[PDB]
Design a protein around this nucleic acid. Sequence first.
RNA 1: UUGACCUCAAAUCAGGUAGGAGUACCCGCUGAACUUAAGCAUAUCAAUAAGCGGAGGAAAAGAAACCAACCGGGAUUGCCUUAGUAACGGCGAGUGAAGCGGCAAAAGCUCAAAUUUGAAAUCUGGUACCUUCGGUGCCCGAGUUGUAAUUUGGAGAGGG
RNA 2: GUUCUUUGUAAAGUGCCUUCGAAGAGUCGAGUUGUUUGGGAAUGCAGCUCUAAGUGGGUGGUAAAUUCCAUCUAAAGCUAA
RNA 3: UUGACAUUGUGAAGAGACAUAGAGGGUGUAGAAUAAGUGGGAGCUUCGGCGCCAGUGAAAUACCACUACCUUUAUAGUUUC
Lengths: 99, 203, 204
Amino acid sequence: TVKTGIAIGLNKGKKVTSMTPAPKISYKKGAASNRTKFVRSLVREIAGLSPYERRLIDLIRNSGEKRARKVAKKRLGSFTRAKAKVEEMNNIIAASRRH
Amino acid sequence: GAYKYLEELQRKKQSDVLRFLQRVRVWEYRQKNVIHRAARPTRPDKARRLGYKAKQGFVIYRVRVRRGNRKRPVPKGATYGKPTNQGVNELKYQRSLRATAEERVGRRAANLRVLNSYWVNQDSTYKYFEVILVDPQHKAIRRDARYNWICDPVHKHREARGLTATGKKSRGINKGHKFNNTKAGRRKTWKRQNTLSLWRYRK
Amino acid sequence: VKELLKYSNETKKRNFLETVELQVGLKNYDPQRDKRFSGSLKLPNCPRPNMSICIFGDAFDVDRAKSCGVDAMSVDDLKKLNKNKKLIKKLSKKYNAFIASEVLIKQVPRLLGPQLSKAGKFPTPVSHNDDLYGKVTDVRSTIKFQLKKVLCLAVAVGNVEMEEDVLVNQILMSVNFFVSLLKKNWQNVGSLVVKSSMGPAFRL
RNA sequence: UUGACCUCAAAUCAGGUAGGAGUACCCGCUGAACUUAAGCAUAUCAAUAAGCGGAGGAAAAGAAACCAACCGGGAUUGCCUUAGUAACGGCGAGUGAAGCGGCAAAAGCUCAAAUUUGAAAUCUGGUACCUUCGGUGCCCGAGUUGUAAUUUGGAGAGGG
RNA sequence: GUUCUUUGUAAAGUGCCUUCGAAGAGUCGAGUUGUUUGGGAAUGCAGCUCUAAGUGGGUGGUAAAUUCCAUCUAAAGCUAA
RNA sequence: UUGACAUUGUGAAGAGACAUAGAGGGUGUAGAAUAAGUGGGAGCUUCGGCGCCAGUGAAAUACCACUACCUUUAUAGUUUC
């Protein structure tokens, strides 16, 4: 990112020649793979949903996503987990009911 | 492998399928004893990540533990102190149900050096776990450069101390500024700063 | 995408059985409420002709009366102030200017209920006349919401070409998606049912 | 009818192992009161004594889901400094750390997650002899609801 | 130091390219109950209810939306001085 | 003791929203008349029925996208008690 070469500034640091080596294997622990993608949707058609996930999709198709994030946040945890949860259930509403 | 499948399957317990299988087996353990030997492990996927090899010396156990909290054993409610110190039903425990169950099966089979265990069932009155123990008596397990540490007296009753996973999470033997008070030997470290040490010379 | 189905491109030029020139509507899906703030109330500016012959009532004076007979409709002056005062409303909309705001005192008695006059809420008075004519006959789409969460407008024609009307519904997929308030729901570009006035509807 | 499989049994069958002691030093759970605040109810004492359970000669721990914001350091511990500070607190009495710097001391790793599948190649016990902490023939069973070989992110493997 | 069996159609190490590349779930977290603490919109820890994901998740000592950078890899274990 | 939730499930009736396609009726006086009612409309169509350049009102009809207000009007799946 390059520094200012001085004590402070928007870049508080020293102007040194960067080496930057090949990054670790501990960076792609969020990698899915064909092994997982496969089984994940396979066991999902076998297990399916639950009672909270049933009235969760009928909350979106009946009301909205602002209201469905307002339920799953008290149903689960963070607003970050709520964003991810609704993305999932919407690819099941569009790609199952229409496709 | 069946492990990759069985593993993610036991993560979606919120499904109607697992809750039927559960209802059957939970009643089954309920029609047994409080402590009894289980012939075959129900989760060889979770059992194998703990360290499971099918053969002589591998004792699987089932525990039917009660829940709730710890009611102080004072007759009538007899206390004697300060109100902040005078609690009764708002009393808990510094240990988890998991950890504690392992300790009771160890007072039973003391010739065995228990490994760990995992959650299997639970309704409301009881909680259920599937324990794993190893017997350092068999030459099969006595030798082998995989379990040698067990046969030594340094691994005699790991659950009684908390040298086990659940006990090391409760005992807080973790890295961090949040686990600073109890990094390793809460009391030793406590007593460490509570020590007034002076050299031959007073600086 | 827009390159596949008709939408406003190719496919529906084997479906029409009419002799006249009709304008097609484009239905979109955008969840909004019953209040007075959530919605896309703007003016989606199109580039090329929509051939919707909505005859005007352009009244200009001096050198603005001459630059009114090429791309625009009716050519009028400042003498035609007592022209449409009676009962005649043979104009979908009008268009005044800098020399017609002083003559905008006698063209107000018969244009109140509907309001097709030249006010200050929907752009009518301009000194650049032969510039805003390629925005009213070419059609700069008129919008104004009612009570529910759906909305139709206007693009162009289908008796022309393919890559000349693919830029007409291009600055519309980014115009009813921007003014569309932050008080809306899941996807501002979803359900697409494109019905003209005789044939079937194609979806994307 | 004969023979298995699953699960639960019986014996003075075989072969083993457990309890109790001690408890100076270490690892848990439970848990005080006195005292102080010139009273005393939070608080402090104290996360102490006793009590209950577990070890060894040290013991526990440990190779980061760490500490940092450096031109970043780099498992555990101990000592000097930090600093009696940051913070805590009838913001009261009081209580109360850490990274770093210096240094002693210094050690690394292995299991699940994979088709050995052109081959359960792996291991117990009996019994024969022996070179007897152990080697090897022969016979059962374990065990395929998964034992060797290989590989644990710092990678690394199927291929060439 | 002296001496006996060839370890072996054994294995280890490196160089180039391709495909890939699985890293522990009634756990994490959250609300709340209580407790310990230097921990202050909650320091850890246990209870009960809810109940996760994979360009993911933990943490950046003030809660939160929002767009980001750093930084590692829990939920298995073993080791002297 | 009282409420709440976990434990804690299978149905039946009765009221009942909803996702969905058809259908249906509302400004009483004028305009022979069925108006909160918008945009396209001179034609959609082997007819021509209305139209319509026309006309009246607070407001023009088949060609009607339904973008609608509305239906405790019939249902192909779930729902609160």
